[PDB]
């Protein structure tokens, strides 16, 4: 069964720099990792805005084909709505897409893997790991 | 898990997977590996080292993430 | 059998103000209407951020239980990534949630139902109606 | 108010609306909405009348949408 | 949600709920409430004040929770 | 949709003392509350060991009939196995049934309602409220 | 078509030591075997508490994917509550997880498969086999 | 090792075991086990041979069960 949801920041970081430290974690936890459809939208955007969309898109599609992509459903949206209010009423900012990724994981009990721990630590009830 | 049976198809010998054991429909190719009297079928090209050693992205893939803030 | 996707603005407009013109449209078009999961997170946020969450949540449920909620899937994610690029340096701004609503609609061929076309007018290939 | 009793028919599970609160004979077909443990029985094409005429949000609901970019 | 139709049953007028809108099977009785041309059906005896004001437990219901530790 | 999973301790507390403070929360959040099957096993045990099993059992059955009971499934068991190890490797004790309740909520993203916050705060990634 | 419920002790015994006598029994009785969700949390705990979790998790999955996992339901919860009382002051001790395994088995009419009958011998109305 | 190609049949989705790694004609029916993205094809009644003969836990696995009451 799945265990980790990779954040958008760690995906870009991995796609760009392909670091061996993250390669170890990927080989070790292969099959237990997923991304939010929100993250898929961001990297497809990163590809389409490049000077070589089809090329960069093709390395995106190879990365995605190795992980499950989870649809952002009513459960994810519900938890995200909670998180937006839980953060608002404590004044701690988190970016809009990161809120949606946060709620998707919490809705399923998944561990967020991110290199931006300072923001995701602002979300209540969510487990964070840094694989970078 | 689920049981099944073997057939004699496309002039060879194949076997079905009911939905309970069916693969993701995006798996177009598979590796078949022989262990004892048992066969192991896995999605072809799934390994991470293959993608980590392969084609890179161009350098312009992030001028910013463009998350509003 | 679906035709219209309600954006977020028409929902708040209806949930907050309950216009009689809208109840005629909703009764007439009942069965053909849906929202994106992105829109659902916003109205859940409005309830949870309010002074009387449990109350506002209950009227959200009564509203949402009368419409289909569509998961924001890979098809929505690709189209939104496309739409963001069509706009990015080639045009005019659209807010992040509205970008996801636009591409989700395009992904399924649905008509956007809105009370404020001013932003959605910027999206290519998308049919829009004003129900306010 | 009056009560009732459930039962099974064609594998589903209906309820006999009492004589005191039967629907108008005009209502040949119905839209059924599920909210919590309650279920709302609306005549087809009058599905939203209960929700519009019924209970309402608090006035503070969301005066702002709070989408970024503004 | 799901649509349906009315019948003329047990010498009265009842209506089905497909599984998508069917109630928990443990609901043996229901309250029917009339609002406009619409009827609201809710599980009978669900309200909390009714149980909070009703029968108490005997005083011996916890000599301990008996969770090991 | 559900939001709260009531712990076993708060249930006994409520069944025994029926406090008005908890009555307010019950009326306010009615329909959004559940218990784990683990909690059902504990109160049925409390009933069966009493001097008036059928009587006390009958007030149990009236309480349960007003809330959804969630089966302790593979997702709940998986999260509980994680929690047992996450607690072990930090040396913080939690009782066996409470571990299972904790994991059931986390598996679904539910808020635990308990009056024993000092123990449930030891569990990572879980949201706690005290309704007493 | 089910007959046997494997307790936790037979699982560890098999997963740790892989006895040849057991592979004959498992091959022969394949399709008739299950575990309780309670047992699943224990082997997941063993993996997560180990020095090599990802590895041990993978062999857990291969094992579990060959057997049905039964949700611990209200029927299991009532029977376990009954069993706890039949023992409570009227007999001899049984550990908490084994109490849940016993009542779950009784709830479905399954035979307990174990390598250590010493505790399960204390439960009324339950059929037991020794497969070690 | 050799590869293969999926296809559709009777709404499900099989695979043609190559001539080089076909099963013994003795295997008329099969048990299929799903683990991650891989699927294990075992002859009926030999379902566990792959798991017993295959990979194994680390020796520290769980020397103690750690159930309370002891």
Numbering used by the authors:
A (entry chain C), C (entry chain A), F (entry chain C), G (entry chain A): 1 to 132
B (entry chain D), E (entry chain D): 0 to 68
D (entry chain B), H (entry chain B): 0, 1G, 2 to 69
Copy text verbatim from the article accompanying this structure deposition.
VapBC TA systems are the most common Type II TA system in bacteria, and consist of a VapB antitoxin and VapC PIN domain-containing toxin. The VapB antitoxin consists of two domains, an N-terminal promoter-binding domain and a C-terminal, intrinsically disordered region, which conceals and inhibits the active site of the VapC toxin in the VapBC complex. Like many Type II TA systems, vapBC expression is auto-regulated at the transcriptional level through direct binding of the higher-order TA complex to two operator sites (OS1 and OS2) in its promoter. The related vapBC locus on the chromosomally integrated Escherichia coli F plasmid is mutated in bacteria that are tolerant to beta-lactam antibiotics, before subsequently evolving resistance.
To investigate the structural consequences of the vapB tolerance mutations, we used X-ray crystallography to determine structures of several VapB variants in complex with VapC. Moreover, the structures of VapBT3NC (2.6 Å), VapBT3N+A13P+L16RC (2.8 Å), and VapBV5EC (3.2 Å) revealed complexes that are virtually identical to the wild-type complex. This demonstrates that the overall architecture and integrity of the VapBC hetero-octamer are unaffected by the tolerance mutations. Of these, Thr3 is close to DNA backbone and could interact directly by hydrogen bonding; substitution to Asn could therefore potentially affect this interaction due to its longer aliphatic side chain. The hydrophobic residues Val5 and Leu16 both point towards the internal, hydrophobic core of the DNA-binding domain. As both residues are changed to polar/charged residues upon mutation (i.e., V5E and L16R), this could destabilize the fold of the domain affecting DNA interaction. Ala13 is located close to a loop, and due to low, local resolution this loop cannot be placed with high confidence in the electron density map. A proline at this position, however, could make the protein backbone more rigid and potentially disrupt the fold of the loop, which is likely important for DNA binding. Interestingly, tolerance mutations that map towards the C terminal end of DNA binding region of VapB (i.e., vapBA13P, vapBL16R, vapBV20G and vapBT3N+A13P+L16R) conferred plasmid stability with only partial Lon dependence; these tolerance mutations also affect plasmid stability in a Clp-independent manner, indicating that their effect does not rely on the activity of other cellular proteases. Of note, some substitutions (VapBA13P, VapBL16R, VapBV20G, and VapBT3N+A13P+L16R) enhanced plasmid maintenance even in the absence of Lon. These substitutions are located towards the body of the complex where VapB interacts with VapC, so they might exert their effect by reducing interactions between VapB and VapC; this is supported by the recovery of vapC loss of function mutants when attempting to clone vapB variants encoding VapBL16R, VapBV20G, and VapBT3N+A13P+L16 into pSTAB2.
